[PDB]
Amino acid sequence: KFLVIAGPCAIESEELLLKVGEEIKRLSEKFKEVEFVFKSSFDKANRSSIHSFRGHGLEYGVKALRKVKEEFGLKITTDIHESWQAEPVAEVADIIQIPAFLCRQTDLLLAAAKTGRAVNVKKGQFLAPWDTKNVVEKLKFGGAKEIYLTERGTTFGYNNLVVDFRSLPIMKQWAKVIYDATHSVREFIFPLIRAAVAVGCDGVFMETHPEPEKALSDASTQLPLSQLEGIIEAILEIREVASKYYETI
Amino acid sequence: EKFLVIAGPCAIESEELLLKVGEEIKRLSEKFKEVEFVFKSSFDKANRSSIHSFRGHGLEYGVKALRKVKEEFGLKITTDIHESWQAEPVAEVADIIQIPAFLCRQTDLLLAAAKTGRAVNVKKGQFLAPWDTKNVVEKLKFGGAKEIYLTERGTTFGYNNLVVDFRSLPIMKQWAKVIYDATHSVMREFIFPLIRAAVAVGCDGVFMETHPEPEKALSDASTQLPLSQLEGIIEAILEIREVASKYYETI
Amino acid sequence: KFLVIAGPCAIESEELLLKVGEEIKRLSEKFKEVEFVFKSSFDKANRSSIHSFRGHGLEYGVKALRKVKEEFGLKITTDIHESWQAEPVAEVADIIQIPAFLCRQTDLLLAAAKTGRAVNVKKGQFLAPWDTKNVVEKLKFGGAKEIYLTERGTTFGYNNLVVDFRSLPIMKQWAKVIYDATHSVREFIFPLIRAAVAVGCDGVFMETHPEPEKALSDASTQLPLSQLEGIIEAILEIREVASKYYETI
Amino acid sequence: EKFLVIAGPCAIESEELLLKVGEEIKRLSEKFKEVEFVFKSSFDKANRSSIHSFRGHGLEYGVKALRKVKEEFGLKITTDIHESWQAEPVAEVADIIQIPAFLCRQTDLLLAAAKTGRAVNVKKGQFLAPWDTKNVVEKLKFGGAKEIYLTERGTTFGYNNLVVDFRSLPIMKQWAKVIYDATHSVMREFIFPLIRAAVAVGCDGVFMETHPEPEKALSDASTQLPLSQLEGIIEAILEIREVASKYYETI
Fold it and tell me: What is a single Pfam family found in this protein's UniProt entry (chains A, C)?
């Protein structure tokens, strides 16, 4: 079924995760045809500035994420940044997320595959679509069977990313495809998520937060919690009509 | 507002070819009555890469052939001009004058088109940013143009490659009606999916080159859409447009 | 010999052209090993805004340009924008310049070739280096024998141009190569002109003006007249040393 | 200031290969005494595209082989790390710790390198803008790094292509010493010309992968420079640098 991975950018506090987990739990009961996965990072390991918020650590993060899975019965996903983190994170995470800049680190992919969990690799802004084939092959070699490739934009000049939707059908030849609606661009988020489902993908990825203008990360992009339902309904309707034309394989 | 579908053979290879495509377009116009069709074809491919490539049979022949289509099917006409002097003669038949991508900044060509009183459709250059089309429209209004279209046809992305930045659709929509060129922005395997993306995002129309037998065409044999496939593609985009339409954001 | 095409962006007045022609005349007598060509446009036919300065017309321009060639004995060059202009312009211009956006207009290239003069085609920001081969072939077919291709940057994201110096040796396979130092980028003008001669080119193209901050065009890029000599001396010295390593053909 | 030349085989295929290249580099260091040479080679290619490609013989073997070079030729050493834990062991031999292009933003890796006290050279990611390296250097200084280098290795330009925007050299020079990677920025036919451009613009050093027989290398067989060609290339850039040096602008 269609996948909808959502949640706040960083684990600002397990309190915040519960508030968002509750709303995601509700949509979950409302859209039985969609599979929801709660997402949040225990650490922003690649911020541009050294003076930026990173998080409360791996343990506190895994802890809070457990609280969401236990209190709401939602599948979980977070990202790892170094091999060793794969095992402790697999304890709670149903899907292990590989950061875009790290989509080429062989040991990181192998470590994620070894846990037995599903793996979702954000496509590097530097990677060509056809070059994701070798990414998948690495993970398969590592024992991974449930593999996702996520579209998040490509380097277009300086400080700018463009979404080449030709990548969805191309990457689909070797793995399920997810579209990152918030990192690929706030005014262009919805327009582009509509294009993604019109083209065809196996799921969408959205960072959401109660009050984005106060979130300690991606405050200019995180989708306002209240708007999630309406966007999910919108893409399910477009998908229903457009799926009729999705090209085979 | 009525969705626009601009389609036809890339080049006016012959008045016969034109009459064959026009016949189908006329049939589809009768079927898809909520669509406003415009028959398109160039009397000259003035910018081919090789000096040895097909160009056309002259402005005279082309305009006469287009006049035949309009006359025989009552279809609106559009064709592109390359130099200022061609605006006047072309305006005698074309309902919409098209400005080529590479020429979107040539002030005199735009002004020549605008004074004819006919509608003008400017293809966004592969070198231009979305927000820089504002001045393009301004030149047109300055020159008397009342009906203006901007067509998205891809952007330079490295060498020999064009990417479509769909954020351009809502940006350009701020100052003009927006058309999506499904055939030049891509190879044929991506025409359909990207056209689906265009209508989901939201545009005022699509532009498609179509030919009875693309493999024999004198230009764009690799990208022209087989005429038999036109109907289905049109039905699909109308379907996707409708279901996505309630979510189109206000400019 | 090495070519140095210089002059003010637009023909603001024949007075301005004489002032610049005088200085170019002087450098001309000082650098006998270099061939100088006076450049200036009679019309800025492709400005972004309709409310921008375009010029004083073709006749007034051809007139003034004649005054420079007669009063200083300098070769002349200006650009055309439509076929018909080729003949009247050839009267004075030793080299006919084709605008970058127009490097693909077959009739414009043929019209320029027909006059018998030399032709210099600015490489479109949208063109790949290897694709200039067909540009040259068009001109040869048109009867042109002295052909130049000019590097002026390539589209790099939005509102930005990058200079891929790999184009110089590539384009050199079929035509002499000129480097446009002022349109390819003011702080980066000199650094890049140095790279161009280090790599190898047949000449440089520079827009210069007495008081750039008052020029009715490219006021943020035009090189200050007073600085021309020092830059010419600099590139001749680098060339002298670097030419030893220029690859054959 | 002394020009830097960082060169060596891409991968530590064997301690023998290393000793063979080191011998030549030592010879050139004796000749070009105004140059500061640094022997480079990776103990692991942790980011190859294919799982079936050569990676290395382990950190243990690599560090021991590099220690051999320094020991036998008195040459400075540099190698790249991939995870935080490798900084400590690697710092026991490397005079300069290299940060891979794809990892230039991984805060912990940079901090790990900086605390060792060794110099750090960060390869500018193909996704990074020149001006965004300011924060890279800031992280390093924050972490205790006193000697910092930024290496230009090309920028993403469409798919499967990298362009070198030489304006980056003076921009990055504002906050750190700048090195030009002649071999990864390009294929071999453009190595020489672009390296000439780098020194004319102005940089503090060059980085070149070199191998006795590139066609047999276990990595970058297409771009590694034949060892026999190293001397001439170095002489040329020193010549071009000198004549262009008086025109280098002040930061």
Answer: DAHP_synth_1
